[PDB]
């Protein structure tokens, strides 16, 4: 069982050891497009790049680059686009991707400012009467409504393709209580947040892949995607106890590097799955 394994690891404080084995086994693929000089300003971190084989391509003849990866979980029947928190100059690209990929939901796992510095650009409008226009990608974004709760905020946004005048409703799920350091004390709120995203249909097949991001779009974002898939798999399989989180994570790392940045995040993922399994079933 998973929970049984969990307790073993704590007993012997092997979290760092286990997490390191995952890192050593993790896939490695080229990221040539990401490294081209013309894309230097499109990357937030020099050590966080999308693999060429699974990168999202913007539908423009000029430069189709954006630091984002498509994570396709064949068995779970679920896909996610993991991306970095957009930059002052890639906000238009960010929404171009949301539009072209036909996404329904945007999942944000960080705050614009953390530990005193900017961890992501203010890419969405904060006031209904102050809409945003991205001239480079000819997109218009309008805050339609907002619902602030204790642990997260859900925003209703309208994205318009000014070229065609077509519009779409985009749901912004913003987890606002992730601690500055470490991980959450309890996976409880994180899990409710996840179910709230599910309940909205943003993760369902009738829509394009949900767009998930934090700062680098690999640590916290990894936690979200890993938890969701594992839980989903425990629902499909005849034998739910066969879901191996370390295996699932390795499968995900074939599509984007460094998903799950610390042993604390790994342990936290186990917690969320184990805890999420008890409510989802018991």
All domains in the chain, ordered by first residue:
1-282 (3.90.190.10)
At what resolution in Å was this solved?
2.2
3-state helix, strand, coil in the chain (%, to 5): 35, 20, 45
CA atoms of 127 and 139, how far apart (whole Å): 17
In the annotation, is 214 catalytic?
A: yes
Binding residue positions: 180, 214-220, 261
CA atoms of 22 and 41, how far apart (whole Å): 31
CA of residue 118 relative to chain centroid, distance: 18
**Residue 102 near residue 208, CB atoms below 8 Å:** yes
Question: E strands within 87-131?
Answer: 105-108, 113-114, 117-118
User: How many C-beta neighbours within 10 Å does residue 177 have?
Assistant: 13
Binding residue positions for substrate: 180, 214-220, 261
Give me the catalytic one of 91, 120, 214, 225.
214
Experimental technique of record: X-ray
Q: What is the DSSP letter of 1?
A: -
Alpha helical stretches, state H, the chain? 2-11, 15-25, 32-35, 91-100, 188-199, 220-236, 245-252, 263-281
């Amino acid at each position: 069982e998973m929970e049984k394994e969990f307790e073993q690891i704590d007993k012997s404080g092997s979290w760092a050891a286990i997490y390191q084995d995952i890192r050593h086994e993790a896939s490695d693929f080229p990221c040539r497009v990401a490294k081209l000089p013309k894309n230097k300003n499109r990357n937030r971190y020099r050590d966080v790049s999308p693999f060429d084989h699974s990168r999202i391509k913007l539908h423009q003849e000029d430069n189709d680059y954006i630091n984002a990866s498509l994570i396709k979980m064949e068995e779970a029947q679920r896909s996610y686009i993991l991306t970095q928190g957009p930059l002052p100059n890639t906000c238009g690209h960010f929404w171009e991707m949301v539009w072209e990929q036909k996404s329904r939901g945007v999942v944000m796992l960080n705050r614009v400012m953390e530990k005193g510095s900017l961890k992501c650009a203010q890419y969405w409008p904060q006031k209904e009467e102050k809409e945003m226009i991205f001239e480079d990608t000819n997109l218009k974004l309008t805050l339609i409504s907002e619902d602030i709760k204790s642990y997260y905020t859900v925003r209703q946004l309208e994205l318009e393709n000014l070229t065609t005048q077509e519009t779409r409703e985009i749901l912004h799920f913003h987890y606002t209580t992730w601690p500055d350091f470490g991980v959450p004390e309890s996976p409880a709120s994180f899990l409710n947040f996840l179910f709230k995203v599910r309940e909205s249909g943003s993760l369902s097949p009738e829509h394009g892949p949900v767009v998930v991001h934090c700062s680098a779009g690999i640590g916290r974002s990894g936690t979200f995607c890993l938890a969701d898939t594992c839980l989903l798999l425990m629902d499909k399989r005849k034998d739910p106890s066969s879901v191996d989180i370390k295996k699932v994570l390795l499968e995900m790392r074939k599509f984007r590097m460094g998903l799950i940045q610390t042993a604390d995040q790994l342990r936290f993922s186990y917690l969320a799955v184990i805890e999420g399994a008890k409510f989802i079933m018991g």
